[PDB]
Amino acid sequence: AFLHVGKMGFVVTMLKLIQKKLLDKTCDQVMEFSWSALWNITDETPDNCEMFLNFNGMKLFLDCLKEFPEKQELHRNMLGLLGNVAEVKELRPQLMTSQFISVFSNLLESKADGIEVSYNACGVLSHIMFDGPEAWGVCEPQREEVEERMWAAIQSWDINSRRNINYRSFEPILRLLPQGISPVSQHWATWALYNLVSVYPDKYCPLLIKEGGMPLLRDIIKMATARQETKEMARKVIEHCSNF
Amino acid sequence: AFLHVGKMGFVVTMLKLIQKKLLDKTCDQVMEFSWSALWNITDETPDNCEMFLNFNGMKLFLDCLKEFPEKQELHRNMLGLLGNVAEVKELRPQLMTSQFISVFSNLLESKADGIEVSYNACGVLSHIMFDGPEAWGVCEPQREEVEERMWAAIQSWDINSRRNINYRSFEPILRLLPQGISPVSQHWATWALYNLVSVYPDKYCPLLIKEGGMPLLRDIIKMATARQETKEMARKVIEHCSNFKEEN
């Protein structure tokens, strides 16, 4: 258990501490904990994502990225937090700026913490791209260029990567499967499931099955808008889950 | 998504800051931050609980309690942390000393931060009681005296108490339902659910339902050996949850 984050204003407490550490130019264990705490308290918790944005958290994120460009765990934790923010459809419009899209697109090539920074940045963009081209009112980083960078990132990851992430539910990922608005978001989501059932089948195969992932992946194989590579990946995900 | 992983260097860093603030005799925001950070990182994370104990956490706890006997926020943070430690079965043997049991039992009557200190002390003791009488050994006070104080504490709390707690999973509470070793621990766990579904149904009815709490509570009501007062609380939880699905 933990305290009541809303009543205690814990999101604000963390962001104030991050601001103090950033001014002292220190990325120590306390700085990294503060971001790790924000990542963890925003999991499936939109009110905490909303409070992060309303307390100017995006500015602290960008300033920390620039002041600490080689701090890999810091980058992982910050991008995990933003991955949770990006799952909230009502908050995504706040991510649709050239400043923010450029950062996420640039992080697709990050080699920090193995694949975690690239993966979480691709997740952020996958939820953004799911809203369709009308939602992309940003002129610089063109949508098609970011999309091609997302395909490049996904294909570059080792499918047997061990991972510094966990999911209590696959529902935000599964929501990217039954749609043709954004094939790249569907491909990211299929890769996410494939990697997890490949490397951690005992935890993630039962999770994927219980939440209805199998019919969703079968539908991908029959889906006109899905790319050949996504259909091939989806059949293999079914493959490992049936063995289970 | 989330990441709940042990971090030896951070547990060590937090314990060192607490020890420093202890020597300074100052329970400032940093002292509260450090204990609340330990509470946060032990949530659903047994590895950080194990590291806390390996790096002398119990002595720091006792010393902070003795140095700062009226600081309610500190007590709430420390007992929150210990509540997470006590969920780990392999770590509970390290809590079985007369020194620690007396401290926890004497917190059952605490009025610090509403009910939070008394509630978390009772939770620590509920997981301890679940281990049975052999684990208690010759620890003092006697196991039956502590059990009676736990019953009394539970009945003293307002069932509609507002709370300074959050659960992301009820797993450690549900673990105390399908067992007959410790009736008081089953009662504490049923109370914990009853309070949360009474006061925060929109959050906790869906969690309890999704995590399989309904069959466990139904089983308590059908168990011939369960205490009627616990059966009636379990029934009220089922009633509240069944009502919840109606509204939605």
Residue numbers in the entry:
A (entry chain A): 514 to 757
B (entry chain D): 514 to 761
Task: Give the article text.
To understand the molecular basis of ZER1/ZYG11B-mediated binding of non-Gly Nt-residue peptides, we determined the crystal structures of ZER1 bound to either SFLH-, AFLH- or TFLH-peptide, as well as the crystal structures of ZYG11B bound to either SFLH-, AFLH- or CFLH- peptide. Structural comparisons indicated that the peptide-binding modes of ZER1 and ZYG11B are similar. In this cavity, the main chains of the first three residues of the bound peptides are coordinated by a set of conserved hydrogen bonds. The main-chain amide and carbonyl of the second residue (F2) on the peptide hydrogen bond to the main-chain respective carbonyl and amide of Asn679 in ZER1 (Ala647 in ZYG11B). The main-chain amide of the third residue on the peptide is anchored by a hydrogen bond with Asn553 in ZER1 (Asn523 in ZYG11B). Our ITC assays indicated that any alanine mutation of W552, D556, N597 or E600 in ZER1, which would disrupt the direct hydrogen bonds with Nt-residue, abolished the binding to the XFLHVGQD (X = Ser, Ala, Cys or Thr) peptides, highlighting the key role of these hydrogen bonds in mediating Nt-residue recognition.
Here we show that ZER1 and ZYG11B can also recognize small Nt-residues other than glycine. Furthermore, we present the crystal structures of ZER1 and ZYG11B bound to various small Nt-residues and uncover the molecular mechanism of non-acetylated substrate recognition by ZER1 and ZYG11B. In conclusion, we propose that ZER1/ZYG11B not only targets Gly/N-degrons for proteasomal degradation, but it also has the ability to bind a defined selection of non-Ac/N-degrons by a conserved molecular mechanism of substrate recognition and target their degradation through the non-Ac/N-degron pathway.
